[PDB]
Amino acid sequence: MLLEAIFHEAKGSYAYPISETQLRVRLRAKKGDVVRCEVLYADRYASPEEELAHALAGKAGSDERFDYFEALLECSTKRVKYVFLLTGPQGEAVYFGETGFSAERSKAGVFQYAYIHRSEVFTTPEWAKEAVIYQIFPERFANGDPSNDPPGTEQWAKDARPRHDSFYGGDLKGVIDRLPYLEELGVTALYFTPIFASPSHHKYDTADYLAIDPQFGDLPTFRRLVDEAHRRGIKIILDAVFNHAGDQFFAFRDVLQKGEQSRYKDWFFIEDFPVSKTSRTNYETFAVQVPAMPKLRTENPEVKEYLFDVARFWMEQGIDGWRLDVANEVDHAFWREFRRLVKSLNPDALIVGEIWHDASGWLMGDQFDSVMNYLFRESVIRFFATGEIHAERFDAELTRARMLYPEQAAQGLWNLLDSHDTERFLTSCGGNEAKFRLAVLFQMTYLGTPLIYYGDEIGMAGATDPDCRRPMIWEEKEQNRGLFEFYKELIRLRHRLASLTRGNVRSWHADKQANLYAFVRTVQDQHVGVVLNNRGEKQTVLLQVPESGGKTWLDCLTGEEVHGKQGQLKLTLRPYQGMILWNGR
């Protein structure tokens, strides 16, 4: 074996708890070097005269370079000392522990998980596990109250192509009216990009955090939206732009009015007074120079309690979550205490982050629940849309990503096709429905929470902003009801097929030439296997039957695939057809 490729921390993504009693321990080796990884383990205090309990780390994923094995340690003392035995393809056998590697056990060492605390088990809202979230971008979703409209609202037309400064007048009241469509579609939560009082089109330079911006409505309308949505089973997650405030923020104005005489000067990062709001910044801002967005000193206790009062307030209104913006430019301390705050006021409130790099620091269980899955988007783009990667490069990029974080976070990343900053997915797939449909057929079966961007269900299009932010299409006969009914098909299967929400994922077939990838989600005895034919051509596959069970499997989209003969399944997939083969458990 190449021993200087094998790796484990006894923390992080590689050893963590799933109850006070149970340690998931994950181990990574270079691809092909190890064929059995076994875990021999006992209580941290147990005497040398006890032989260790055993746990086989089965192989759970493989990537570009690596091979990933994963086992579950029963630990009734909530304290475990373990050692890995690693047998290679010829039959070498080696031990790995903290002191290193030996053919003799006791020279390799032990890894220990000193104690499993009850608080320190990453716990996630039950509801979040079967959610389908719908990103409403509020200015563009529905104009339900024309008295709202900003001076210069343009007219709601499918033909209309938005400028960066266009207004169409969408609002909270219009969402209140569109709620039987959201219930039709079957979503379970609604995510608003920031709706809070700001003097600009884009509400990221927050002027007031306790008022809904006048374009979209007011507190009584927000409260009724909450109360109308909750009746239909939809939750309200809200953007929080706590990293920076807007230049009209009460405090920032006071510093502007008074320099150092200001009570609020240290709420911000000022270089020289007087605070020259001009083009040339002399305070820290949202990224380089952005005068309308000074950076808040979240480390300062006064700033910290203000935004905490802001959280409290919106939770009084009854929102079920936050999706946090530039979460990584504010300190870990703030998010740990934010977590505690939000989670005592509402245990089921969801906390998503937005971080465009490995989010592990945040996804330990003590700051956030999940983060926006950019790695899902970069893959689904490259596989279905651009056709820049082939089925095995997909499997490697899926599997690499899956093993970045503990499972409890991984089963909850918001798996998006696009957003209000990216071009639309259909337009990434240059109008081809079948490339799109297959990428949504995956998205509704893979591990994560599906996040639909407004209008995709019904076939919208658009290059990047502002053509992603194009007025929604409400007219039946100018909307793709064929697609709509297909999101409803898939959502209905997500919502009644427990593997899809709660199961794990194993790769089942990757073929570089045919470009067919296939995966199996399983919980407790149930397996549903999604076969995806990503080529323009009718092809055919022998797939070897999955580990746990299947003699007859039903296509949940159409009808029976009883063709399990001699450990192989033979299917012939028409161009771009996925298939969802449930087993009956």
UniProtKB/Swiss-Prot annotation:
Keywords: Calcium, Carbohydrate metabolism, Glycosidase, Hydrolase, Metal-binding
Catalytic residue positions: 325, 354
GO terms for MF: metal ion binding; neopullulanase activity
Domain of life: Bacteria
Family in the record: Belongs to the glycosyl hydrolase 13 family.
Binding residue positions for substrate: 244, 323, 420-421, 465, 469
Pfam families, alphabetized: Alpha-amylase (PF00128), Alpha-amylase_N (PF02903), Malt_amylase_C (PF16657)
Protein name: Neopullulanase 2
Record function comment: Hydrolyzes pullulan efficiently but only a small amount of starch. Endohydrolysis of 1,4-alpha-glucosidic linkages in pullulan to form panose. Also cleaves (1-6)-alpha-glucosidic linkages to form maltotriose.
GO terms of biological process kind: carbohydrate metabolic process
